[PDB]
Amino acid sequence: LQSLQTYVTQQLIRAAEIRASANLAATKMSECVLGQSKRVDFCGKGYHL
Amino acid sequence: VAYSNNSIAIPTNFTISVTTEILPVSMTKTSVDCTMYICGDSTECSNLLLQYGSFCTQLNRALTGIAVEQDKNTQEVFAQVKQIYKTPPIKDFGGFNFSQILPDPSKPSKRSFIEDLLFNKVTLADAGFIKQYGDCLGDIAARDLICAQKFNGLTVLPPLLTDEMIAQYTSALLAGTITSGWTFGAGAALQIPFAMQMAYRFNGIGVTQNVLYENQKLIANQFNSAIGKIQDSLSSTASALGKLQD
Amino acid sequence: KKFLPFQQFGRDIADTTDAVRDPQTLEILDITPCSFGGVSVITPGTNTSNQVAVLYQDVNCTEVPVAIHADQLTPTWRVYSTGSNVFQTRAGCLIGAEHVNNSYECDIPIGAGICASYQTSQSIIAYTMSLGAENSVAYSNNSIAIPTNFTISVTTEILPVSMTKTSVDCTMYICGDSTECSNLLLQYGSFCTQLNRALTGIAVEQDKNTQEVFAQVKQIYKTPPIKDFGGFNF
Amino acid sequence: MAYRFNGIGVTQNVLYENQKLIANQFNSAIGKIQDSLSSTASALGKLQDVVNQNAQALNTLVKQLSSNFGAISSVLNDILSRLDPPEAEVQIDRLITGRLQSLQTYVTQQLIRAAEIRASANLAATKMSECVLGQSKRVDFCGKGYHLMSFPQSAPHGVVFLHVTYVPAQEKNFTTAPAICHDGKAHFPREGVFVSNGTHWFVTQRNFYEPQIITTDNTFVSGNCDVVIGIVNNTVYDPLQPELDS
Amino acid sequence: GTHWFVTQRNFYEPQIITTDNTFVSGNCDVVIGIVNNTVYDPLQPELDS
Ligand SMILES: *[C@@H]1O[C@H](CO)[C@@H](O)[C@H](O)[C@H]1NC(C)=O
Ligand SMILES: *[C@@H]1O[C@H](CO)[C@@H](O)[C@H](O)[C@H]1NC(C)=O
Ligand SMILES: *[C@@H]1O[C@H](CO)[C@@H](O)[C@H](O)[C@H]1NC(C)=O
Ligand SMILES: *[C@@H]1O[C@H](CO)[C@@H](O)[C@H](O)[C@H]1NC(C)=O
Ligand SMILES: *[C@@H]1O[C@H](CO)[C@@H](O)[C@H](O)[C@H]1NC(C)=O
Ligand SMILES: *[C@@H]1O[C@H](CO)[C@@H](O)[C@H](O)[C@H]1NC(C)=O
């Protein structure tokens, strides 16, 4: 039970990190793919097209 | 920097550059049978575990919530547009060549060449439980292979979205970006020549469109060279996909 | 497996026996457990209906009565282990679901593109999901499309801000009003201090979350008495 | 509203010529939102997870006291009234370890849930500081479509945003050219798109149809007209030429 | 070093300084580092009657 609890807690932390990464990826999709972003160094490096 | 109160530097040319960014989306959806993992159908062990309470139900609920959250992340990162746009049969986008990124109709899988390289790069060669669980699906020639609970109840759930529909969504996004620009994201798709889209995206960064209309051939050649360089770098032995491998 | 001579049994990484040798004929065997507990059920709401369909996870439809030993169970378990509406997919075996060739929006997700919904003679149907409406763009190198009208639309977005501020007394929850038990609790250290401090930090963070969201401005602006907004009605 | 229309590339004369239509469309959209919210829709489920998960975790915390964790009884007073401290302490510490481990598990899950709320609250504060306090050029951040304004509303354990967006409709096909060659010189549009109905050439803005006569005020000249791919020969009207009679 | 020109900030596109691409605001003495130069007027190269 201690081993399973450790595994579940580590999986929860990793899932939170994956959630943050997926939210960042969805934001990058919605900005750079569906339009042009004026934010510097958000979509690649330099002036984004 | 040669700084002064009356000196400025103005570029005389430019270089179109294509870079690669890799971001993780989802993880492996794993479900654990707590009672099976604790013991192998021992009724005395089950009776002793029932004295502890609702630990196994809580862990199963947490794992189910994790899997549902992974599916929600994939759906919210890929199903941005509900209109599945198709690529035009004739491709004359001002000399720009998108053959490396467009889907290939010559294969049952709708993945592109670059997508095929990405799929071939990431592998489960030296993995442990995941590769052993996936090998049971390649061992279907032998009957009576109950590999679902063979590893003490540790199961791997298949994703809600498979690779084919994800590739279809990416192809639809590429078609909407090429044919409609940024208009299809806000609302209904508006067809537009690719030169107009390049001109207005040049205008969005403070560059007049006559630069594009005078150097379109050079811009297309530089873009094709950058696409070829990206393809050659991805096809090389460099481990550029280490983020998903982690 | 080439069993060199007196090496008799085997085990995996988790020390469970996977190979064994018969002590009489000296033949070699392989071992695969057979319990199964991973069942899934797709059902609508009880306030709506009472029909129920069950998914058998990662097992073939031809091996259901052997893995679960259905013939030794109730006939209601038998009729849900063998029936007319039996379907096999990548996710596993579905019994009771009505497979159709149509495609709709996903209602109850199963896996590998399989979704179920309640359809009218009401029954639970199973179908492959539809990504969306099929669309094509009439692309050309000299043709453009310009909109002639527009529609103002209002969309609703909901985001959580705060969370219920809970506070737990560690000494009370472990054992109430017992001095002997409280004496034994001090032998475990400052575990109660850590839990009280962690929950206090959560409650402060919840108040910070409400403060940092709703107090972007520091002046309370009163609404004007007249509503002359050019036809806009707020 | 005229300035916010100017923020998405629409000229302010379009809003003033259709102010009554915009106000009627906005009031109908508010009533449609009000009628949809007043119905039996379950769109408030995002706030419902916070309430239900807290209620489930609190009930699981209470129900964990019923477990004996291998002791004689789950009641502390039963052990204290039946046993003596020379032999009661071997039964108490099993209940101590079981209940403390449940308290460790609950607080750990609360900390993970608090971090999830922290990410959502930071996103809500970012949306409030951008959509409400100004106009955002970012795509699909303040709702789907071209964002104009937003209205925040209070909610139990959350906030509700009412994004007012701009969605074009009633598309029409047109024939376009990148530039116009008039006297051997290429004329490019200053802001809009060169369009034609097949008989006459007009210039209109990108996000709305409003044809205008091609003049020197709305066009600029850059280089010869031999290097532009797809150029169309057409005349350019001079607003100064009829006034030269003196 | 010989003649003055006006160009955009991201590309070298020298042009003749006219009244269309410029505007007038204030006198010469307030601006620090002003340079005396002529400005072409496209209204009257020869446009007289
Ligand atoms: C399930 O049964 C089908 C047909 O009998 C067979 O082709 C397939 O390999 C079986 N799957 C497994 C995992 O045994
Ligand atoms: C045990 O006896 C059986 C029956 O005669 C025989 O077939 C088998 O070979 C014997 N095994 C050994 C190890 O002698
Ligand atoms: C429950 O069912 C009743 C009718 O039996 C219906 O009026 C009601 O709206 C239903 N509730 C929900 C939440 O669907
Ligand atoms: C569904 O498609 C299969 C072939 O994929 C066909 O055999 C079957 O008759 C179809 N059923 C219906 C109801 O169209
Ligand atoms: C557009 O493509 C067609 C081929 O379908 C070609 O004949 C025509 O010249 C092209 N026009 C321009 C302006 O590139
Ligand atoms: C610019 O710097 C030079 C070098 O120090 C100096 O001589 C000149 O006066 C400066 N210009 C102004 C306007 O101060």
Tab-separated table of N, CA and C and ligand atoms in Angstrom, chain C residues 22-26, ligand 2:
chain	number	residue	atom	x	y	z
C	22	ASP	N	7.159	-30.310	-14.581
C	22	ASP	CA	6.450	-31.452	-14.017
C	22	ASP	C	7.448	-32.408	-13.372
C	23	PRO	N	7.257	-32.785	-12.104
C	23	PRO	CA	8.224	-33.679	-11.444
C	23	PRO	C	8.204	-35.115	-11.948
C	24	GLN	N	7.248	-35.498	-12.797
C	24	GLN	CA	7.152	-36.873	-13.279
C	24	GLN	C	7.680	-37.026	-14.702
C	25	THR	N	7.123	-36.272	-15.647
C	25	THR	CA	7.509	-36.390	-17.046
C	25	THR	C	8.630	-35.440	-17.443
C	26	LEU	N	9.058	-34.560	-16.528
C	26	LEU	CA	10.150	-33.603	-16.742
C	26	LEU	C	9.886	-32.675	-17.926
F	2	LIG	C1	7.449	-41.447	-13.413
F	2	LIG	O1	6.581	-42.555	-13.713
F	2	LIG	C2	5.889	-42.436	-14.965
F	2	LIG	C3	4.976	-43.635	-15.074
F	2	LIG	O2	5.701	-44.811	-15.406
F	2	LIG	C4	6.897	-42.349	-16.110
F	2	LIG	O3	6.201	-42.152	-17.336
F	2	LIG	C5	7.868	-41.198	-15.872
F	2	LIG	O4	8.875	-41.196	-16.876
F	2	LIG	C6	8.521	-41.324	-14.498
F	2	LIG	N1	9.398	-40.194	-14.241
F	2	LIG	C7	10.653	-40.329	-13.804
F	2	LIG	C8	11.417	-39.056	-13.593
F	2	LIG	O5	11.152	-41.430	-13.587
